[PDB]
Swiss-Prot record, chain E:
Family under the similarity heading: Belongs to the sigma-70 factor family. RpoD/SigA subfamily.
Keywords: Cytoplasm, DNA-binding, Sigma factor, Transcription, Transcription regulation
Residue numbers spanned by region Sigma-70 factor domain-2: 110-180
Name of this protein: RNA polymerase sigma factor SigA
Spans annotated as Sigma-70 factor domain-3: 189-267
Species lineage: Bacteria, Thermotogati, Deinococcota, Deinococci, Thermales
Localization annotation: Cytoplasm
Residue ranges of the region described as Sigma-70 factor domain-1: 1-36
Domain notes: Contains 4 domains, connected by flexible linkers. In the active conformation, the domains are in an extended conformation, each making extensive interactions with the RNA polymerase catalytic core.
Curated annotation (Swiss-Prot), chain F:
Lineage of producing organism: Bacteria, Thermotogati, Deinococcota, Deinococci, Thermales
Part of the whole protein covered: 107 to 211 of 1524
Function: DNA-dependent RNA polymerase catalyzes the transcription of DNA into RNA using the four ribonucleoside triphosphates as substrates.
Record's subunit section: The RNAP catalytic core consists of 2 alpha, 1 beta, 1 beta' and 1 omega subunit. When a sigma factor is associated with the core the holoenzyme is formed, which can initiate transcription.
Gene that produces this protein: rpoC
Entry protein name: DNA-directed RNA polymerase subunit beta'
Signal peptide positions on this chain: none
Highest taxon of the lineage: Bacteria
Family named by the database record: Belongs to the RNA polymerase beta' chain family.
Swiss-Prot record, chain G:
Parent-record interval covered: 1072 to 1118 of 1119
Organism of origin: Thermus thermophilus (strain ATCC 27634 / DSM 579 / HB8)
Quaternary structure note: The RNAP catalytic core consists of 2 alpha, 1 beta, 1 beta' and 1 omega subunit. When a sigma factor is associated with the core the holoenzyme is formed, which can initiate transcription.
Full protein name: DNA-directed RNA polymerase subunit beta
Family that this chain belongs to: Belongs to the RNA polymerase beta chain family.
Origin: domain of life: Bacteria
Transmembrane segments: none
Biological function: DNA-dependent RNA polymerase catalyzes the transcription of DNA into RNA using the four ribonucleoside triphosphates as substrates.
Length: 210, 52, 49, 51, 327, 105, 47, 49, 48
DNA sequence: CCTGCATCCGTGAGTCGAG
DNA sequence: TATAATGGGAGCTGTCACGGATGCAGG
């Protein structure tokens, strides 16, 4: 204030007191610290794979067995990402894919009622929570609210991709049946692989008593 | 039984990398490390030392 | 012959089955003491022995 | 061309968007009265295709 | 570990307001909005724009995002341009900037302070088709609406005015999102009314009512058909993964045929139909061929007309073998 | 999926990555000359909620006065840890004390 | 028609597998010997 | 046991409707919702193993 | 009976709770038109 | 601190038929 | 759209045996 006469001694945030006619700077820093997939993705983009490969290579020469082991385990992932041409930040999702409606059908059965896949409900959760997150962002919601919302979003993506993987599995109202995620569809004894690929039900077949 | 055991014996673990880009303790197929070694020998390079 | 508005959905005897029809039951909406599940106009049962 | 290989790899967000025929916006399925796919819904024909 | 316990912990971090603090924050908010209107009268910018710039500066550099309401994209560059056009105003005018800033800060503090109320309200709405946390979030939206719409002049404690909006938003959410097939809110009201009515009638009658009795207790305009159709529209779909049997073996969706894709016999039906029609058309003269096939649309997909009609009547009565295709 | 791929690349334990992704603790991309507990903030450091709140927003505390009791110290006066703000109240931290809602003018 | 049965083509369940793997954000590509993409959707899924 | 479950749920409903509404005009008819009990028993006799 | 603690007003009533399925003479039930049987379940007797 | 053993967590657990 | 209301609620209990990672006390 005062045309540049009075300035600040320390880093901090400004509270202008009009009553006491004083500019009070609370001691604080501009420090950039985040939470969740934003922070993690940022950390992923910054990664220089060649550099880390070099560091891990230097670590590979240490007389300790465990250190060489862990350095190897890391270097395998690093070199995997290197050779594959895959950016590590792709492990974090911006655009979530949406499966074609016929692989998650809403279809009227014989009785005139409707039958629908659980993927539709999971997608519904995800979409609703994403919309609410966007609206809360545009309306200038506080910290804690946006935090909880982002957490819920992450758990909705979790529920969609693999359900019951982390925490208690998402279920339908008044039901203990865990919903079927994409992971549940692919793997397992009832999974797409074993059930619909390695074996099939076939036409031109029959059976009877011998 | 010999077929199955043969499938069990398929893998090796690198004891020393030699002149390769391979790492110590890395596990790869015996065939692959043998072709790699035969290529390095033809290149005059020090081969990879591996444990069954 | 002009195109007809409806199509033949009729209940037919399944393969390898059959017999003599012993009984029939017909429940209709608007009949005394008869109420079906919502939307259902009528329900027919056929007992074949 | 006969398929001689199958490759699996991570999908970039740009790739995921290059797959999509549109963004699903509303968390809606079908109209209650018409039983037709709702616009910008999970079943919307303007995205996935004609019924 | 548990998301709800974590949220309840993060909620217990903000201490509850004393009456003086509540009044103070509300006052600062209201005067802040007034100050924004004032700055709009001074600078000549959009009240929404100025508000979002003030908010941008209060929240931090972390949050700057394009607002659907604004006429321009809000980047930090633009918020700095506008901030520089606000700061360069005369002193007595520049006062309102500070007023608005502390207004926004007070708003944030006020919303964060009352978050427990949303929990205690949403705990009554459990099991209605929405998760606890979702109810909590929509209730939070209600709380924000309350903060923006609150008037401290009326000397009413903030919880009173906020509770209404919280219930409003929670209920709006329960009505909107709780059904896979979306039914408009008023129709949901109708359905719920019908259900309550049926429960009453069945409570007094010692048995489940008919459609006519429901139509009676429903009043004018209501008959059996409408009750039946309304109950019909209120039916929720069932999951294809609904377990069939005691074990994990098969799903309900494995018993449902696909009525869309033609079975091989249907493709063969079209094939044999086009074939038989093509081969039995030998009667056709060329002009009548192109014109009658344009009549029936056998070419581009959409007096001699009469002679071709008559000739087709002639060849129908001939072979008597095409009946099969006619179902 | 153990061992975590993301966790392996960025060198974080399952517990830590869990804490960050699910919004328990923060993590620092740009310290910006921050200092906590006498040691400056290193990048890739996990901060609790309280720690980040203190670094970003500063430290402060409010002390309630029993009704009808004047304080021992005035408005805008500097305060040292241990210095009592009232006959019944002692301050935990340093910094400036301020008057919240004076009952008597 | 009394003729011999035609050469079989790609089973639908593998297509279902590919699309379900895509919804998991994993790209599964069918390739030729020259490492070029082969389209099993016949241009139906490509814009 | 299922009767007991539905009964406890009914009780939860009773308390929930007790806290709200007019504290003056209320009757056991307006307090008691039998739906959870009916649903418990019906679920038992229909869908139990 | 609804009993007010403060007021003391006691409002007594008989409310209809729905129906309980009845067991037939032979020991079975009729649920939705179909004859059913509830199978007795052995388990560990509670205690210490 | 580097090695070794104790402990936790996730992953599996036959086929077809009928319901 | 205004009395005031300010931290949830159910839990699922009698398998068994493995690989891998993670951690702690001990040499
Ligand atoms: Mg009527």
């Amino acid at each position: 204030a005062d045309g540049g006469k009075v300035k600040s001694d320390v880093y901090g945030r400004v509270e202008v007191d009009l009553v006491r006619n004083v500019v009070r700077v609370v001691e604080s820093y501009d420090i950039d610290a985040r939470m969740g997939a934003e922070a993690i993705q940022q950390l992923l983009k910054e990664l220089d794979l060649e550099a880390l490969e070099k560091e891990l290579l230097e670590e590979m020469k240490h007389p300790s067995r465990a250190r060489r082991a862990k350095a190897r385990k890391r270097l395998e992932v690093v070199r995997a990402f290197l050779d594959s041409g895959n950016r590590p930040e792709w492990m974090i999702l911006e655009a979530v894919p949406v499966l074609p409606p016929d692989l998650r059908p809403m279809v009227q059965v014989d009785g005139g009622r409707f039958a629908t896949s659980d993927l539709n409900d999971l997608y519904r959760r995800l979409i609703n929570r994403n919309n609410r997150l966007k609206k809360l962002l545009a309306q200038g919601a506080p910290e804690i609210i946006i935090r909880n919302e982002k957490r819920m979003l992450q758990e909705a993506v979790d529920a969609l991709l693999d359900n019951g993987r982390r925490g208690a599995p998402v279920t339908n109202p008044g039901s203990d049946r865990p919903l079927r995620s994409l992971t549940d569809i692919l793997s397992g004894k009832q999974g797409r692989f074993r059930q619909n690929l390695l074996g099939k039900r076939v036409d031109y077949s029959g059976r009877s008593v011998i | 039984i010999e077929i199955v055991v043969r499938q069990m014996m398929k893998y090796v673990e690198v004891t020393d990398p030699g002149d390769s880009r391979l790492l110590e303790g890395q596990v790869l197929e015996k065939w692959d490390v043998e072709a790699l070694n035969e290529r390095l020998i033809a290149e005059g390079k020090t081969p990879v030392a591996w444990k069954p | 012959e002009k195109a007809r508005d409806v199509k033949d959905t009729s209940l037919r005897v399944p393969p390898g089955e059959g017999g003599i029809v012993v009984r029939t039951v017909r429940l209709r909406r608007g009949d005394p003491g008869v109420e079906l599940k919502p939307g259902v106009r009528e329900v027919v049962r056929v007992y074949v022995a | 061309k006969e398929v001689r290989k199958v490759r699996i790899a991570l999908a970039s967000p740009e790739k995921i968007r290059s797959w999509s025929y549109g963004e699903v916006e509303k968390p809606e399925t079908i109209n209650y009265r018409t039983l037709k796919p709702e616009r910008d819904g999970l079943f919307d024909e303007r995205i996935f295709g004609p019924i | 570990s548990d998301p709800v316990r974590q949220y309840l912990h993060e909620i217990g971090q903000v201490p509850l307001l004393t009456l003086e603090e509540e009044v103070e924050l509300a006052r600062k908010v209201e005067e802040g909005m007034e100050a924004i209107k004032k700055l709009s009268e001074i600078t000549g910018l959009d009240p929404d724009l100025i508000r979002e710039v003030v908010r941008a500066k209060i929240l931090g550099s972390a949050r700057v995002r394009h607002i659907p309401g604004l006429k321009e994209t809000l980047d930090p560059k633009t918020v700095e341009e506008i901030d520089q056009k606000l700061k360069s105003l005369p002193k007595e005018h520049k006062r309102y900037l500070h007023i608005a800033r502390e207004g926004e800060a007070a708003r944030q503090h006020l919303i964060e302070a009352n978050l427990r109320l949303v929990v205690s309200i949403a705990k009554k709405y459990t099991g209605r088709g929405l998760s606890f946390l979702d109810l909590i979030q929509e209730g939070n939206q209600g709380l924000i609406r309350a903060v923006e719409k609150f008037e401290y002049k009326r000397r009413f404690k903030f919880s009173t005015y906020a509770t209404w909006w919280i219930r409003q938003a929670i209920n709006r959410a329960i009505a909107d999102q709780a059904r896979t097939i979306r039914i408009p809110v008023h129709m949901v009201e109708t359905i719920n009314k019908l259900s309550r009515t049926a429960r009453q009638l069945q409570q007094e009658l010692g048995r489940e009512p008919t459609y006519e009795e429901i139509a009676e207790a429903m009043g004018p305009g209501w008959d059996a058909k409408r009750v039946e159709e309304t109950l019909k529209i209120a039916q929720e779909p069932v999951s294809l993964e609904t377990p069939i049997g005691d074990e994990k073996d098969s799903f309900y969706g494995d018993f449902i045929p696909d009525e869309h894709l033609p079975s091989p016999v249907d493709a063969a039906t079209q094939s044999l139909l086009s074939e038989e029609l093509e081969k039995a058309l030998s009667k056709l003269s060329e002009r009548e061929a192109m014109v009658l096939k344009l009549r029936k649309g056998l070419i581009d997909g959409r007096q001699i007309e009469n002679k071709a009609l008559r000739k087709l009547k002639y060849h129908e009565s001939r072979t008597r073998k095409l009946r099969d295709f006619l179902d | 999926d153990v061992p975590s791929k993301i966790g392996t690349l960025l060198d974080l334990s399952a517990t830590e990555l869990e804490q960050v992704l699910y919004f328990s603790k923060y993590i620092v991309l740009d310290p910006k000359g921050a200092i906590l507990n006498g040691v400056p903030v290193e990048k890739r450091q996990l901060l609790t909620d309280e720690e980040y709140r203190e670094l970003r927003y500063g430290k402060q505390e409010t002390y309630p006065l029993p009704p009808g009791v004047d304080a021992l110290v005035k408005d805008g006066e500097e305060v040292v840890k241990g210095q009592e703000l009232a006959p019944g109240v002692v301050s935990r931290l340093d910094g400036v004390a301020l008057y919240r809602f004076p009952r008597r003018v | 028609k009394g003729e011999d049965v035609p050469e079989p083509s790609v089973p639908e369940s593998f297509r279902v597998l590919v699309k379900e793997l895509q919804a998991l954000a994993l790209d599964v590509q069918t390739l030729d010997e020259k490492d070029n993409p082969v389209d099993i959707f016949e241009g139906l899924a490509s814009k | 046991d299922q009767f007991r479950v539905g009964l406890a749920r009914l009780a939860r409903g009773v308390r929930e409707r007790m806290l709200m509404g007019s504290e003056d005009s209320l009757t056991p008819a307006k307090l008691v919702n039998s739906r959870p009990l009916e649903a418990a028993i019906r679920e038992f006799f229909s869908r139990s193993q | 009976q609804l009993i007010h603690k403060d007021t003391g007003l006691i409002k007594e009533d008989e409310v209809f709770l729905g129906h309980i399925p009845l067991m037939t003479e032979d020991g079975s039930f009729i649920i939705n038109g179909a004859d059913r049987v509830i199978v007795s379940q052995i388990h560990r007797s509670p205690g210490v």
